[PDB]
Amino acid sequence: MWENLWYLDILINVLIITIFGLISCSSSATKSYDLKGCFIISMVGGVYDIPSAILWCLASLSILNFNGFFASLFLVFTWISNLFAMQSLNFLGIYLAFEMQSLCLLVLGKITANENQRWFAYRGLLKYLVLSLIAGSIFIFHASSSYLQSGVMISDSLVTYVFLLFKLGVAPFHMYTLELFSVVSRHVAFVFSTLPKLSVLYLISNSNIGSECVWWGLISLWLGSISQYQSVFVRSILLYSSVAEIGLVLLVLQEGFSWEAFSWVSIYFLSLSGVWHANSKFVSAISVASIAGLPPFLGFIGKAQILKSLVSINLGILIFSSILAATISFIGYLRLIRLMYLVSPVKWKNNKDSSFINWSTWMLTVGTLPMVYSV
Amino acid sequence: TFNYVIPYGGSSSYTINNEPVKAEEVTVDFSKEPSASSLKLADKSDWIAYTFNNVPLMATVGLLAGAHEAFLHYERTPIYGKRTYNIIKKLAPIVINKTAYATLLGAIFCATDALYENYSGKKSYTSGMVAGAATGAVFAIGRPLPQPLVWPLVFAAAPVIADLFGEVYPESMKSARGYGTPYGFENLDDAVPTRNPIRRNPHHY
Amino acid sequence: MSLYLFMLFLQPLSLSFVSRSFSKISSLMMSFATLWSAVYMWFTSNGANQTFYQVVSWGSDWSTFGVCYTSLYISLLCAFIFPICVILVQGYRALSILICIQTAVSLSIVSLHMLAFYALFESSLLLFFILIGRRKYGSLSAAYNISIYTFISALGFLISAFWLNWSFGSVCALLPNEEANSFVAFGIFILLWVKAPLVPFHLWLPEAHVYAPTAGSVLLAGVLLKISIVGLHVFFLPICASSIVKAFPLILSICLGSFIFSSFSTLKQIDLKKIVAYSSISHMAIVFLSSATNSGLGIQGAVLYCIAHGLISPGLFLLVGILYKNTNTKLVFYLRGLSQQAPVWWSVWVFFMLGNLAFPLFPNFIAEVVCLSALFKNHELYAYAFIFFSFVGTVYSSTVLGRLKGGVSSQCVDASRLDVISWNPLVLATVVTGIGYM
Amino acid sequence: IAFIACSVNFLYASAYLNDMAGMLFSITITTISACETALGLALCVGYFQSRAANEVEALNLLK
Amino acid sequence: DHDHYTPPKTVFEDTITINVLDYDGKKHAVKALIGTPLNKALVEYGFSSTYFFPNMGYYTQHISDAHVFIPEEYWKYVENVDLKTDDAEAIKLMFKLVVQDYQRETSFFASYLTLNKEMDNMTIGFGPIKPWHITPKWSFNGHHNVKDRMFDRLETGPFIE
Amino acid sequence: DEPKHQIPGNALDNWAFLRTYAKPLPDMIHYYYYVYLFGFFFVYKVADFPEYSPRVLVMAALIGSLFYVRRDWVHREFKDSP
Amino acid sequence: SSRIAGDTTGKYTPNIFSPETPMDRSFSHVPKNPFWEAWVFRRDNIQREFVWTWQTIFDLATFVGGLYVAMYATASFCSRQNDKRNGYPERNYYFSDSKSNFVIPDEREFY
Ligand SMILES: CCCCCCCCCCCCCCCCCC(=O)OC[C@H](COP(=O)([O-])OCC(O)COP(=O)([O-])OC[C@@H](COC(=O)CCCCCCCCCCCCCCCCC)OC(=O)CCCCCCCCCCCCCCCCC)OC(=O)CCCCCCCCCCCCCCCCC
Ligand SMILES: CCCCCCCCCCCCCCCCCC(=O)OC[C@H](COP(=O)([O-])OCC(O)COP(=O)([O-])OC[C@@H](COC(=O)CCCCCCCCCCCCCCCCC)OC(=O)CCCCCCCCCCCCCCCCC)OC(=O)CCCCCCCCCCCCCCCCC
Ligand SMILES: CCCCCCCCCCCCCCCCCC(=O)OC[C@H](COP(=O)([O-])OCC(O)COP(=O)([O-])OC[C@@H](COC(=O)CCCCCCCCCCCCCCCCC)OC(=O)CCCCCCCCCCCCCCCCC)OC(=O)CCCCCCCCCCCCCCCCC
Ligand SMILES: CCCCCCCCCCCCCCCCCC(=O)O[C@@H](COC(=O)CCCCCCCCCCCCCCC)COP(=O)(O)OCC[N+](C)(C)C
Ligand SMILES: CCCCCCCCCCCCCCCCCCCC(=O)O[C@H](COC(=O)CCCCCCCCCCCCCC)COP(=O)(O)OCCN
Ligand SMILES: CCCCCCCCCCCCCCCCCCCC(=O)O[C@H](COC(=O)CCCCCCCCCCCCCC)COP(=O)(O)OCCN
Ligand SMILES: CCCCCCCCCCCCCCCCCCCC(=O)O[C@H](COC(=O)CCCCCCCCCCCCCC)COP(=O)(O)OCCN
Ligand SMILES: CCCCCCCCCCCCCCCCCCCC(=O)O[C@H](COC(=O)CCCCCCCCCCCCCC)COP(=O)(O)OCCN
Structure with a gap:
């Protein structure tokens, strides 16, 4: 009965915080900092290893920028789904955890849209839902x-x-x-383009879910890079950058390089935080540079881990594709830098809510030298 | 050397050889050998057989491209308005022509590659270059001025790229290990492994 | 060595704490302090230590720094030429960008780790994109060109460094490693091919120089092109000598073709800055070929010629900048009568142009003689080819001088006190090197 | 309909192998499918209530 | 040398009025200066933010454009665009995503027409626009019922909501 | 006044060409549904495909790249006719 | 109509409101020409008038490729002569097909 207690504690913690937040719901504290802190403390009871500690770090950082009890609760639900995805041993664990996470995405996307933004947000949520249903149905049938x-x-x-x-x-x-x-809030897009990945990478690495085929990562790398170069909108540039990189990371993870993907996901999270939560031009520039992979920033270490892994497997086609696709991506990132400081005067909203943004920019600059041992 | 007086680098004796020493006491290989199918398809002995084995790939790519274009045309056409013309009659040429052209180009490439390799008798870069050049010549039969020069070059280059990074690269860098002692330098005192690291099990998907 | 590195780290640091009104004075004093520290490093470098004069490590292979013959000359050249760039630039933003670029470049020269070398040299990538693409006087095309060319070449170099770190287990120069792989050699070579402009990868340089500020152009031609020779001597010839010997007919073809095509292209130029840029491209070919011969005469000759270029090209770019400030034109056709109207600018211009043509009392002569001797050591035809085609440089330089020398002009456009102060160190250094104190 | 088909296949497999795994996957499908449908229908209603006058077949995206 | 100086004209002399038909169908007299692009003149007058969309070009999103109907006589003053450049890509993207079916042969974008003396008393109309999205903040639901002004939007253009 | 690049073509002809992109736009969901479905089935089938030579693979990739038609291209040229 | 902007004593002030034009650095700028400016623009933007014609291909191949071929052939000849002169075995060059592995001469060995 004692092993069960470890899991049971998380449920008891979530329920009591839920009912406390419901009972203590008032206009005076719309931003429930106390509940955010309780949720963070609760999620420390599920840390068992280093990947779980990275899951905790990322979830806590994501929770900081959500406003209101409801959004933070749905992030805790996302965390629970992610924790269970890593521990899934068969088809039922995989299906259950991933579909719960899909539900949390659908809710988080729905509850962070204004009335004027409902037409496009609800369309994008519906398209996501229908595609998710195709994926889940084909999965369960097979x-x-x-x-x-x-x-x-x-x-x-x-x-x-x-x-x-x-x-x-x-x-x-x-x-x-x-x-x-493209149609959802910037925070929701940021937290759900990084956090979910860690669980999938852990599942792949631990359950030996690798294929001999390199076509899918090669395709993602080339499509993403070319689409990033041809995209007019800045949201599409950032979205296609993740496609290209996760394609390369997929290729690296199939060959057994788990440590490098777990370090990459953390650096990518820190790099993406400042570009997505744009408030200052300088923070955004340092973020774009880190995503690009420039050597003075932590982004260089993350890209270096993947490139270093690629040279070990000794596949020539992947290395050539990687170099050319990286150059094409670099052109898109240069476009982003040009848009901020070299095109026109830029005025942005004074959203002074840089919870972990200053810390992330500092961690990107400073972190390169401590983590130099890895590469 | 890092000096301005003597030539940099070094010289190795050609007479003196170093007896090969195994990387590890026991070698476990997680890399599977080529399948009998791969060798069968790769066999260029009979040009007709080689061509017919390798065209399925070109046909599939042509079918995917034709399906893409046909879908794009079909999606735009309006369901609500009745159309006098038959949609399939409009769309079927798109797919058929794309598949036929792709298959013809891939057949030309495979045939010329096999015929040159047989006539020359050696596996060489030239066989790929001449197959690519012939395919690019067939592609640019009626195209304006620049294209006759550009397509034979791009097409000839593609087998060069495939040969350099698909065949020469791996064989060239087979010896490098990454664990224990550097391949060339075994005298150096580095930790010696009993068994090679097995980072992944042989794939099966 | 430790003093030089500390001063290097202090120069960017000082800007954060200055008053924002004392920025220029503080930056100049820091540049002079860095020069003095470089002189101290030279003093503390004993010739008795034949291989590396000094090596310092700060806890890791990446933080391994050291000075050799090539490194010492290039570092002294960078410290000598930086004060001129500093005085020519105005504004905190410009100073910050320039000081960061200089710190990154100067740290790259002394680095002995390939990965650290890459980390330091390519850090100054956005800063050049922003500098060459400045609001009014910059071109976005030039910025994109230089940035993309640098990224692609440095990424290839990075891939080669990763393979060497995986295979050998270390990528530090101080550990003797040899490789016969041609893919890895090509990866290291492509960086050198692009950075030191060699046909057909030289297009980025002229655009960048024309649309860069005078401080930027001076730094670029003076030392940025030299960073290739440090990579060759420190990170290519020790490990990939076999591939340079295997490909010598191809290397020679590409270097001679670069020298010829660049010389011919210089003939069609109507902009003074483009003329100086294409002259640099032509001059880089001899240095590259001489080093590739892997002979004592070649390595010394290449480094010496590099110093001579790093003393002659900044002078021409400085004079061109002064003239442009006075007249707001770089077209040779608009500039006439400069002999009569600017006798003092003209004298220095003629002197520097004579230096660029490798006349005997200039460092270029001695350097060229040594490089030609190295080529003649390889083959007599190799030397002859280079010697014969040198006339093309004369034709373009003579035509430019003749167009500028005479005509009718109604504007007195001569150098001020500040302009003479900026070139005096370069003139004295040129004279001293010319007389044989190389 | 598709999810029901897959759940039926799991129940069939459970009967074939005398195993409870399919019955538990199938109850999971029933739960998740109903939650997904409820959320999707909520999204559809919200999408329809925000339709502009010009829009005609708002629900028919595939038109 | 030293020719006669030409004194500048007063604003009254260089103000031209254009009659602009809005989406609701009301006609507004928009006074405008000669030499200003139509987009800027329309923005200053005080039309709502729904009536304008960012120029969908790689580096032109800061500019706010509008779909306008120009009379056949004033087509000459529209600016030529090179197809092999990216300005054409901007125009094609705005037609594909904003105008769509509501296109007419008279359809043009305000940025490519510059007001001149000969455009006095010109009647232009706002052309219908389809719902469009770039970012959640920069989008059009399809309802022209907001009563703000495009002038009152300080933010230059789309980036990240 | 400054020197400017000459624009080939007449102003009204170029604008007319640009206006041929202003056509009813389909939603991208319809394309995506089919691509997802067929892509899933394709991935399942790919595991059973015979191993092809690198040269043949590269040539197939080249042919596919050349024969790929951008979505905008069909959009501009689409005519509802026989 | 003109005044001296520069003051050696250091009491320099810009009289932005002066009726008389300051003799600043802008006094000595050279007057541009509408036609020269257009020539400069045309010369720099000469890629627009580039056309692929048989004459262009001929000229490019004959001079650029021709020089590259001549240079490669000369370098190969010089390498062959040096190898014969030095007494070294035929070296394995990149494009040369030689059944010998010789590349770098051994310093210890006497050739
Ligand atoms: C103080 C001592 C700390 C020193 C060591 C720490 C170990 C002891 C843990 C002690 C706790 C200190 C926390 C530090 C580490 C956290 C790990 C951990 O805690 O569990 C590990 C530990 C055992 O796991 P393990 O040591 O990892 O080894 C297991 C196997 O070896 C398998 O695990 P493995 O994965 O490690 O296997 C080895 C691995 C090798 O793996 C490694 O080498 C790891 C490298 C370390 C990197 C560290 C960064 C990771 C980020 C997480 C930050 C920590 C957050 C703290 C969260 C927990 C807070 C307590 O090999 C691999 O290839 C796998 C890949 C691993 C991932 C790749 C590493 C890259 C990470 C990303 C780096 C990228 C850089 C980004 C930014 C960098 C900028 C500088 O578990 C425990 O001891 C029990 C957990 C208890 C935690 C909470 C319980 C106490 C409270 C109970 C009630 C709570 C409610 C009340 C709240 C009270 C407060 C209000
Ligand atoms: C203990 C006793 C005390 C003794 C002191 C000892 C303490 C040691 C260090 C403490 C010194 C303070 C550190 C400074 C922090 C803030 C610096 C800053 O904001 O820069 C601009 C700032 C000028 O501020 P501002 O003029 O008032 O206006 C800025 C406005 O905020 C926004 O203006 P805007 O919107 O118009 O932006 C225009 C932008 C044009 O747009 C761009 O160009 C964007 C380009 C993206 C980044 C540039 C990529 C290349 C940068 C290469 C790194 C430079 C060093 C090269 C060496 C190679 C290293 C591998 O141009 C610039 O901002 C300046 C251009 C060049 C500066 C770029 C260098 C800064 C890199 C990262 C800064 C650190 C921020 C951390 C954040 C912490 C919490 C938030 O500071 C400077 O004076 C120049 C930069 C000084 C660089 C030293 C910082 C270290 C970074 C090197 C990385 C090495 C790892 C770190 C270890 C350091 C030692 C442990
Ligand atoms: C019934 C339903 C209808 C669908 C039919 C089938 C349904 C799918 C079933 C199965 C699908 C899985 C496999 C299909 C392909 C995978 C792609 C995919 O599914 O993504 C979803 C994709 C839509 O995703 P999206 O994110 O919404 O659209 C992103 C684009 O921006 C879309 O925007 P965009 O279209 O407006 O922009 C297109 C852009 C997008 O860019 C790309 O397409 C990037 C793809 C590049 C290569 C892809 C990786 C190649 C590796 C293949 C691996 C196998 C070979 C192994 C070794 C090869 C080593 C490379 O590219 C272009 O600009 C057009 C040029 C085409 C390629 C550019 C490269 C040219 C190089 C040739 C050099 C010759 C020029 C010399 C002269 C130049 C003068 C200076 O759906 C499809 O496109 C499926 C249509 C199937 C047609 C593919 C044709 C052949 C397929 C295999 C050949 C492999 C090459 C790929 C070529 C084009 C593929 C897009
Ligand atoms: C070895 C470390 C390196 C590896 C990195 C990973 C490990 C992380 C180590 C350090 C983590 C530090 C994380 C920095 C977070 C920055 C602090 C923060 O975000 O504070 C927010 C917190 O905002 C909140 O929402 C508060 C809610 C909860 C508060 C904290 C919860 C505490 C729970 C207990 C945590 C203890 C851990 C439990 C046991 C480990 C305040 O910002 P705002 O007020 O929202 O806006 C700022 C406005 N402006 C800056 C512009 C002035
Ligand atoms: C990135 C490489 C792509 C090549 C770029 C070249 C320029 C593109 C123009 C398209 C032309 C098609 C590609 C031709 C390049 C091959 C070189 C021709 C030399 C040659 O014909 O010899 C072959 C071997 O060379 C070979 O096939 C191996 C040589 C490797 C190619 C050159 C490698 C470095 C080039 C990179 C320069 C700059 C990079 C920027 C692109 C024959 O050999 P054989 O064995 O058949 O003997 C014959 C026994 N029957
Ligand atoms: C297995 C793979 C098989 C092979 C497949 C190859 C497929 C493609 C590979 C190409 C990869 C090269 C990446 C460079 C692409 C060329 C540059 C893009 C052209 C361009 O328009 O860039 C503009 C400025 O760029 C510039 O000004 C840069 C000028 C050109 C850069 C020169 C490239 C560097 C040197 C090339 C090779 C050097 C050594 C090679 C080893 C910026 O456009 P925008 O921001 O306005 O975007 C708006 C959208 N149009
Ligand atoms: C056509 C003229 C050639 C243009 C180059 C001119 C001068 C470049 C010389 C650079 C000096 C060192 C570079 C070493 C070799 C590069 C090119 C040498 C010529 C060459 O292509 O030889 C090939 C072998 O090289 C190879 O197999 C590798 C070729 C280079 C790979 C291309 C891109 C690699 C980028 C990889 C990035 C980092 C990867 C690190 C893992 C085939 O000659 P053969 O011996 O087979 O003779 C069979 C003919 N009958
Ligand atoms: C599409 C792109 C290309 C299309 C157009 C290309 C047209 C160019 C064709 C001819 C170009 C010049 C001729 C050089 C190659 C001739 C034939 C190559 C075969 C060859 O190596 O024969 C050697 C030629 O003599 C030599 O060693 C070289 C003699 C000519 C060099 C001097 C001529 C001009 C001098 C100008 C300066 C250039 C070089 C500067 C160093 C002598 O045979 P072998 O005894 O070596 O036996 C070696 C075994 N075949």
């Missing part, structure tokens, strides 16, 4: 055929690999990210 043929539910199968490919958003399963994340 899983049923596999369970019937083999008699057992084994997470080492092509069915799970293709499903996790959809979840990562590589090859041709990246369009939901483009459609949904």
